[PDB]
């Protein structure tokens, strides 16, 4: 049920801005950063939306006019797509699946050029879609350094301490057109997802739903993404997609979503909601514990599977031999 913005400003959004899917979902809890339940959840690596962290309070004034004036003259990675679904791919891995034609190109440009491109597309009533996704780095202007320094490091550093996480590895800046969709995938790092401008619908699935979401092969360029097209699920190829259940939420300015490591997430900028801006915080997960405790947790089995695929890749001398070997192993033997 949509949240009513303060000052009686009506509903921030409504259901009609949500895309429709075949699976049911249940709400991710929205809580105060000071609520012990929110701590139990993060400790247990379950998603939670924190409403009042002030994690990126200085960024809440960011829009394209302000950033263009302040984010420096460095290069920004911008993805193009002829559709709302921005399927991404690892370039390094494109060698070993030549029957793979990309759905989205990456293009390096100056920020002001990206703003021009958006301006153009709107003006010309075009259909092309852009999505800026660029790591924050040294080349940013002084005003941005000051905003960045103003983030609530006291809070997030304590979170990194209490969870025994590794180092902050990066902050991804994401600027996206309304209707844009990042299809379901999982990441191998802990993620605090800080929403800044506009509204993003986030659908999460736990690691133990690996079986229902059918990730690409590890050596495929779309490694870690679901193969299932949520807009038209092929139940003949992916029968257990019929048993999938999401955790969902809509984050707005000031909201922080904890996306636990290995949790699948599908993310969309609300239809007719304007551009969206997010900054995320990626932390390496805690180390593997000295003593393993059985039964294994689902994310640990996903770790194992990934490793089996990787090793067979090396061992056979060719990742394209991995599938045939695995099938030889199970057919009439384990199935």
């Amino acid at each position: 049920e949509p949240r009513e913005e303060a000052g009686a400003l009506g509903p921030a959004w409504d259901e009609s801005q949500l895309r429709s899917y075949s699976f049911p979902t249940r709400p991710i809890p929205r809580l105060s950063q000071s609520d012990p339940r929110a701590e139990e959840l993060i400790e247990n690596e379950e998603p939670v939306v924190l409403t009042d962290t002030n994690l990126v309070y200085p960024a809440l004034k960011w829009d394209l006019e302000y950033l263009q004036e302040n984010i420096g003259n460095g290069d920004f990675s911008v993805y193009s797509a002829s559709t709302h679904k921005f399927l991404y791919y690892d370039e390094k891995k494109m060698a070993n699946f030549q029957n793979f034609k990309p759905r989205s190109n990456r293009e390096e440009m100056k920020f002001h050029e990206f703003v021009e491109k958006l301006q153009d597309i709107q003006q010309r009533g075009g259909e092309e879609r852009l999505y800026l996704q660029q790591t924050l780095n040294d080349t940013v202007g002084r005003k941005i350094v000051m905003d960045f320094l103003g983030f609530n490091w006291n809070w997030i550093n304590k979170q990194q301490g209490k969870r025994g996480w590794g180092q902050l590895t990066s902050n991804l800046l994401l600027i996206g057109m309304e209707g844009n969709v990042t299809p379901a995938h999982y990441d191998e790092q802990q993620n605090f997802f800080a929403q800044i401008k506009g509204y993003k619908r986030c659908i999460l699935f736990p690691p133990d739903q690996f079986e229902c979401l059918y990730p690409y092969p590890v050596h495929h360029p779309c490694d870690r993404q679901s193969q299932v097209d949520f807009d038209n699920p092929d139940y003949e190829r992916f029968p257990n997609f019929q048993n999938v259940v999401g955790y969902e939420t809509v984050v707005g300015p000031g909201d922080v979503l904890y996306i636990p490591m290995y949790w699948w997430h599908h993310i969309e900028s609300l239809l007719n909601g304007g551009i969206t801006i997010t900054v995320n915080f990626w932390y390496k997960g805690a180390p593997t514990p000295k003593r393993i405790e059985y039964p294994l947790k689902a994310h640990q089995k996903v770790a194992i599977m990934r490793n089996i695929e990787k090793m067979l890749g090396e061992a056979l001398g060719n990742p394209q031999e991995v599938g045939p070997l695995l099938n030889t192993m199970i057919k009439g033997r384990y199935n």
Binding site: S77, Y79, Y88, D90, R106, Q133, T169, S170, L172, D187, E188, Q189, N191, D223, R224, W282, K284, G285, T288, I292, Q300, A303, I304, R306, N307, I308
Partner: peptide
């Protein structure tokens, strides 16, 4: 070794 080898994870994110 084995188990610790099979349990180690990469750090792959996003793009």
């Amino acid at each position: 070794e084995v188990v610790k080898l099979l349990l180690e994870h990469g750090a792959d994110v996003x793009a």
